[PDB]
Design a protein around this ligand. Sequence first.
Ligand code: HEC
Length: 108
Amino acid sequence: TEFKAGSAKKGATLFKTRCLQCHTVEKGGPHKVGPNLHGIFGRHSGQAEGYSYTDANIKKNVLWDENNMSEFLTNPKKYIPGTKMAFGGLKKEKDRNDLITYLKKATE
Ligand code: HEC
């Protein structure tokens, strides 16, 4: 244990103001700058179809779990050096948690 549920709501506002600019969560939503993330958990890194991921992601070969996703979220360039995710990070444990709670939810 090292991940505890957050507010899906709050969850859904970080996404909007922090991840939508680049991504969609929804089954059938398109890839934009980043890929769509519907069904992200359970799946491995860089496998959405019709998406051109860096060498980095693919190689990283990550199992998208909640616990992973949080450290990634802490610092992505750090997690997967060579990723094209120009996303600095979410330094707060709390913020991450609501986010992941939202993700857990909306991409299922
Ligand atoms: C645009 C400037 C982005 C923002 C803001 C966020 N992400 Fe991102 N994401 C982006 C790219 C360009 C890529 C692929 C990079 C590469 O190495 O090819 C990604 C990848 C992800 C992944 C990996 C998914 C996979 O299928 O392997 C995840 C899980 C992801 N992005 C989620 C995500 C979230 C939750 C964000 C908000 C806090 C977010 N990203 C921001 C581009 C952009």
